[PDB]
Amino acid sequence: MHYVTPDLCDAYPELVQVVEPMFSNFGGRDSFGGEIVTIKCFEDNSLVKEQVDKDGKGKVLVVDGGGSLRRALLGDMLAEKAAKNGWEGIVVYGCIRDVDVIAQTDLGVQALASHPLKTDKRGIGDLNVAVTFGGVTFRPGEFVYADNNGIIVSPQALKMP
Amino acid sequence: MHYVTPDLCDAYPELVQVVEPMFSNFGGRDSFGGEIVTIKCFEDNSLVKEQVDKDGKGKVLVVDGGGSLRRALLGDMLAEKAAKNGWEGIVVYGCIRDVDVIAQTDLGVQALASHPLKTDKRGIGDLNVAVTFGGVTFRPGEFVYADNNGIIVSPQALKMP
Amino acid sequence: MHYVTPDLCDAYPELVQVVEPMFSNFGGRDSFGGEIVTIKCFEDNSLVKEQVDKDGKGKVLVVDGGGSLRRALLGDMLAEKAAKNGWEGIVVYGCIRDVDVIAQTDLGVQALASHPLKTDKRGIGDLNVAVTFGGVTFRPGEFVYADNNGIIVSPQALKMP
Amino acid sequence: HYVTPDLCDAYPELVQVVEPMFSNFGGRDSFGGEIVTIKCFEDNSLVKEQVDKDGKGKVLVVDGGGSLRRALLGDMLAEKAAKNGWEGIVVYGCIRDVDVIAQTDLGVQALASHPLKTDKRGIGDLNVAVTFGGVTFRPGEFVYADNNGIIVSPQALKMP
Amino acid sequence: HYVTPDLCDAYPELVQVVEPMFSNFGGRDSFGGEIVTIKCFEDNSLVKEQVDKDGKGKVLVVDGGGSLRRALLGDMLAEKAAKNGWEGIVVYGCIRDVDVIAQTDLGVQALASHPLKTDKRGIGDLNVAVTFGGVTFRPGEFVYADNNGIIVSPQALKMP
Amino acid sequence: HYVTPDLCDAYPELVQVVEPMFSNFGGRDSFGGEIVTIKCFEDNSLVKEQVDKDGKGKVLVVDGGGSLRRALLGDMLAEKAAKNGWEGIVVYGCIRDVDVIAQTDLGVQALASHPLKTDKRGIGDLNVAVTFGGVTFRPGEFVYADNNGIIVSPQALKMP
């Protein structure tokens, strides 16, 4: 399902909040949206590995990686796993890698930047806690929508006009 | 008419000033140039709506939107209106939206970023006042040229070498 | 020879350092790598002109231009000269120009941004001194590798896994 | 300011009256001057060309074949014409943006309004004799219009 | 908690015993409930569909044609089933992720393990009678499994 | 430093003099050493290959077929040769960048200058006997050049 983020803002002005314009599209799907599931982590993608292995149909993985520009939290293997498991997309407050393959993966991916250095997995991270970055609080069970225009959040599921 | 902005700098070094490198190309035309017409506004694109409805042949609309990263000042409808009305291009010190359609529109568009949230039109703004952003003062009646390399201004009309 | 910068980080974690994510790919070759040769300069590309005229097979030209966003240090003529002379690529802590032609040139080019204004050549610059920018010290005789994911440095030559 | 009855009364041997089929749309309900003509059909390419030029003391007479399927003038072109000094425009055809044109400092007479714009393809003849509503409009001759009707004369007429 | 010998002893006129060919893999070594069936082959599309639904008091009986070439259940689907209240799953075919399934709060019996997953193409029949290992499994009837074997009954059985 | 008259006088039974058609272009007007040859035509692929190698005590003799349509050596390759220890280069053909080559620490003799470079296609023979200007240049034999001319000898000659 594709989303037009200006259309959703126009239709639901009292419901939407727009994320600060700092993210870039990296995935093969330009637009994506669904129910929020969150990870809070830092330079450890243990929980990212765990979550992409779960069924993600109708869901978007929102990863608070503390905005680190020192390590990648997602690569081609995890992106492909997420795509096969039905994940609508992944938003990373942090970096990703394998951008040439992720660009060809059937998955929405928004991140701050790329970085080639992978993380040491030590099982550190919190699942489904409220996370706050880029002027927006992302809450599990609420909704996120993303395209080439930006990222938006709503407490309720939105349908395209 | 297409412009090569390095060529113009080389030919007219005593006339050109280069805008600070902060803008991005969004329009279907990579290069554009012409006589400056200015708008000073903030999170209100009333005058943008008005100006794209005027004949813009040989002219570039320079929009000082205060650099706001909270609202869009141009979308697909206004971009198409500008294209049909002969506007060479639009430079926005601020944000635009509908980037997928604007990329297919016969119009030059340079802006800071995209943002899906539209503006409340209240008729606030000044037409054809001197506006200053990104290290350059844009004056009505003077000239602006833009491509994939950057944006330049000259007090006199320049022709490609 | 093409390089995958995540693959090199994974294979040689005790040898690699990753450059701060601030550079962009501009050249026709997305990936490149080889032995470092350095220039320290500022808003004067005299030594860039000199070096692209030398045989660059297996070498990458690392240009410390002080990060200037006011002038270009490389254009289409110098990029083509470098490509013909076998240079693997050029990394510019500063700006380049003629991006539409450089994108079609058989050369790797990473830079901060584009800027149309060329430099006054006055023969100012140092060749093959240690240069430090973006969190990394680039030393002549050491090695640099770059792709769409980022830029990495190693004191020893690395081979793809 | 022209009054067509006064002009008909003063110059009976010079005037021809256009068949009463036109309506006033502009902010100026009376206007007159030297005729420049356009022959076109459902293409206002030349209309745009002319309103861009100095039109002081002149009236643009547009033979659009009387089409009630497309508009040949709107607010943007009316604004241009007013700013460039045109006395008025007579359209054998339709116009649009009637609410804006009604407060534009320009004389506009047409058959009717129609909201659909034309596709501009550069088709049209400039300054050829055009004939509609019982009258032949010749470039260099004169036309005067008010709330009473439209009249033509081969020579310039002065208001009494 | 079910004990198949106790159930066979208590209800001799109601029970059929499945041919001894299945092995226990789940964290619960005993389970039972109402049968829902899937007929498939080297495609677990419907397995995924069903473990997504409320399975309280129910056992998913998967006729995978006894294929020893592909797995029809893994840890992700086993986790879903456990969370959604399924009592257990019986697979005439193979499963995978045996180390994770062994600590999942779910009953799982299958022929063997096999690490290769299927291509999901939406092929399969839901709630048709399925026959394997000497027994016909009918939706709405009942199945009970432990370390001793698997048994079926047309009526719900209560543990002594 | 070699003086060809002195060498001709000292070793009359060993020397052959190249036909006087070559000019001095390099910063060293006299040079000599062991011959390594290239046979090519309007393609300097092998020239570039050789100047990249250690050339101490050696002279690169390039049979370019005497082409006056393309240059086979320029400042970049001359710089390489000088840095890599080459005594000099003799080109039966043309060179370019004469102003830079004149201050390069290398012996260079050629027929003429020509500004047009060749297309490099990997065509050429290394260390084959080459014959031009009345002389056969054999790899492993010796060549000496100054402002007087160029001479060859099958054995190494010592300056008096």
From Swiss-Prot, chains D, E, F:
This protein's UniProt keywords: Lyase, Metal-binding
Q: Detail which positions bind substrate.
A: 74-77, 96
Q: Which GO terms describe its molecular function?
A: 4-hydroxy-4-methyl-2-oxoglutarate aldolase activity; metal ion binding; oxaloacetate decarboxylase activity; ribonuclease inhibitor activity
Q: Give the highest taxon in the source lineage.
A: Bacteria
Q: Which InterPro entries does this entry report, sorted A to Z? A: RraA, RraA/RraA-like, RraA/RraA-like_sf
Query: Cofactor: bound how, per the entry note?
Result: Divalent metal cation.
Q: Which cofactor does it need?
A: a divalent metal cation
Known catalytic reactions: 4-hydroxy-4-methyl-2-oxoglutarate = 2 pyruvate; oxaloacetate + H(+) = pyruvate + CO2
Q: What does this protein do?
A: Catalyzes the aldol cleavage of 4-hydroxy-4-methyl-2-oxoglutarate (HMG) into 2 molecules of pyruvate. Also contains a secondary oxaloacetate (OAA) decarboxylase activity due to the common pyruvate enolate transition state formed following C-C bond cleavage in the retro-aldol and decarboxylation reactions.
Family in the record:
Belongs to the class II aldolase/RraA-like family.
Q: What is this protein called?
A: Putative 4-hydroxy-4-methyl-2-oxoglutarate aldolase
